[PDB]
DNA sequence: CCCTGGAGAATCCCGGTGCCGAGGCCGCTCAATTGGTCGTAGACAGCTCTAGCACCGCTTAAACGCACGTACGCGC
């Protein structure tokens, strides 16, 4: 308490984001962290029970469901994108999306 | 024949609550179908979680989780605190 | 635990939307995307953590998650 | 035989919890069926009624009307936050949709 | 029995668009909704058949149409 | 004299407020019927169908069909319009699971 | 007493008859279980299961690998519209989603 | 130790009828597992269900008929309704 | 301003290690299989009777269509 206080590629946007997503929708690996997720799962655990563990598994089950859901959620969101004319996602596109799926 | 309903228990209730106003064919019939399919959901959650920890009973603890479960926010509390208060008012 | 909602980095967003397919991610769905996040784990480990107490148990296993995923429609294989 | 008195009437309840037992007996979903769960579950539909009755009657009398129509019904399951995600996946019928309207649909 | 696909008329489709809360009604939109009720029905009536046909039955009651809805996660009350 | 002309919106307005607070069926009983018998015509050519069995499935097709089309007015106004269109119907089934 | 011949060779069947008889008799279900019930849903079990390994096989063949990887069954499962519908809502875990790209993302 | 219920080999020799060729790494048998779990559950419920919305004790191949033609879509259904008959044929053969 | 030739960098096919998870094998034991025996749900025959199928008057609110223009869908 007692203290006082020659020139570059240049890679336009867009094709390198394709590129990506050529890259992770054939991919197989977890794109979350391990340790941040499993973090704020026993942070979300411990404002309704103290003194709670989660073993390796089910923090695995868990972090697999979070990003199927958020990946779905993404396609939504992208395919009411482009069903407003558009190339990128607002946060508005999502909050529709829930509202359609009824969560 | 004889049917099985629950028409006179959801009157009294509304009597108890509310004695000035009545009911219809219609409004009772969507409220029966409404608490059959509510007693089908928290029997079925309850029959599984028996059915999960190799449980051979339902317990009132078994009604408790499929309220929490199925009932979300201060609605499942209130419904175990008055499940709770008939159990003790039962014993 | 404290500040744990920001352990979702920006990047694991921008990938998670790169495996959906977005084309251009807004500097604004991070949090939006953070929130849903907490919400729907907010329903899943309290589901769980209902299942865990009403076997007795102190730590909650897989197949309590899964049967917290099945009951709302977002069945998981695997566990 | 002694005097037949209900266990509704003992738990201070109005539903049948031998009614409950019964179907839970015959509804073939568990071996035993203990004895504070038909109470447990009367209890939480007794609840649940009465919420559901007295948010129709509110509406009701929000129109004016003093018999509980199944419009009365709709609007007090739809006006309840808790009611409409436990009723999310519900049909009611003779009961219509909330009477709302976009901001941008005002001209 | 043919052609009873247009029974649906024009406007009993303004009115189902008009009760949730539609401004503005495209022309081609009725075909569309006409192609979706379609689908929906031949997937509850088909399932009312299934049901029908393991109860013994030959005429379609409403509690095998409320059976076969709530399977799918439309439970209709009243019937 | 010259008529009233009522604005594009107005008449609009009265039928959503109208239909908002009325019960009533908007699809008429018969023709809904007659498509529900040839519909279970393709399953089964010797069946019956109770009345109330064709007013269940009149009052869940007409609640499943106003509620995609809230969400398609939704998705509409997402999408800088007013008007609805048959892609917005297919987003909101894409969506919900059933397209 | 005779040779203790299994129920699965003796219906042309791979999948245990008497494990799903006994799921079925302990799972709560029914009070009975009839003779040809375990055989009509060991068949459709041994039906799905062939059917899902066979669009995995396939996929996997596609993609030149021996061994079936979870990838191999989420192709399989999402690619079949059989197989979509019948598991719209179920998730599958290390698996991902359909490598798609809409026609307007390409420049 | 204690024995757990599972059809890893079953899925295994299914496998090694229709492709003779081809392996199967674990997490891959556990998610065959786990779908053939929920798959069994699902008709048996819907057997159950069936037996009980006619007032019937037993659940006989009828009901996983309702159940698999309720359930499985289409041409899927059709397959496996006239798998289960062959397999109903043969059993009391 | 558009088409075509040359090169930087992410991506794809390929040779070599090997290793750690997958395939096959040893028991054996606990769940799968065989036979009998009843209570009992279920298949089958006759009655019926209350609700559904088909047609008819009619009339009237519901629905197809055409004329006009201004909010809104779409192009820039």
């Known amino acids: 308490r007692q203290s006082t206080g020659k020139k570059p590629h240049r890679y336009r946007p867009g094709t390198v984001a394709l590129r990506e997503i050529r890259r992770y929708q054939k991919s197989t690996e977890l794109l979350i962290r391990k340790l941040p997720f499993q973090r704020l799962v026993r942070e979300i655990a411990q404002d309704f029970k103290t003194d709670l563990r989660f073993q390796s598994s089910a923090v695995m089950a868990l972090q697999e469901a979070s990003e199927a859901y958020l990946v779905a959620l993404f396609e939504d969101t992208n395919l009411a994108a482009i069903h407003a004319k558009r190339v990128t996602i607002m946060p508005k596109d999502i909050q529709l999306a829930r509202r359609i799926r009824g969560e | 024949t004889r049917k099985e309903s629950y028409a006179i228990y959801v009157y009294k209730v509304l ?44 317990t009132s603890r078994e009604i408790q989780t499929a309220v929490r479960l199925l009932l979300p926010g201060e609605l499942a509390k209130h419904a175990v605190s008055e499940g709770t208060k008939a159990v003790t008012k039962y014993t | 635990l404290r500040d744990n909602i920001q352990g979702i980095t920006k990047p694991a967003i921008r990938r998670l939307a790169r495996r959906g397919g977005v084309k251009r ?51 998981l294989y695997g566990f | 035989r002694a005097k037949a008195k209900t266990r509704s009437s003992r738990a201070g309840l109005q539903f049948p919890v031998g009614r409950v037992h019964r179907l839970l007996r015959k509804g073939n979903y568990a071996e035993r069926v203990g004895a504070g769960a038909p109470v447990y579950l009367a209890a939480v539909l007794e609840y649940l009624t009465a919420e559901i009755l007295e948010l129709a009657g509110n509406a009701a009398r929000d129109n004016k009307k003093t018999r509980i129509i199944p419009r009365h019904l709709q609007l007090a399951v739809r006006n309840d936050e808790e009611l409409n995600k436990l009723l999310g996946r519900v049909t009611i019928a003779q009961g219509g949709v909330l009477p709302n309207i976009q901001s941008v649909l005002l001209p």
């Open chain 2, 15 to 58: 009597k108890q609550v509310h004695p000035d106003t009545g009911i219809s064919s219609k409004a009772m019939s969507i409220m029966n179908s409404f608490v059959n399919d509510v007693f089908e959901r928290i029997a079925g959650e309850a029959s599984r979680l028996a059915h999960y920890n190799k449980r051979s009973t339902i």
């Open chain 3, 25 to 75: 991610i807004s500097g604004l769905i991070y949090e939006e995307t953070r929130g849903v996040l907490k919400v729907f784990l907010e329903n899943v480990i309290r589901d769980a953590v209902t299942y865990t107490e009403h076997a007795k148990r102190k730590t909650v296993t897989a197949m309590d998650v899964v049967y917290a995923l099945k009951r709302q429609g977002r069945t």
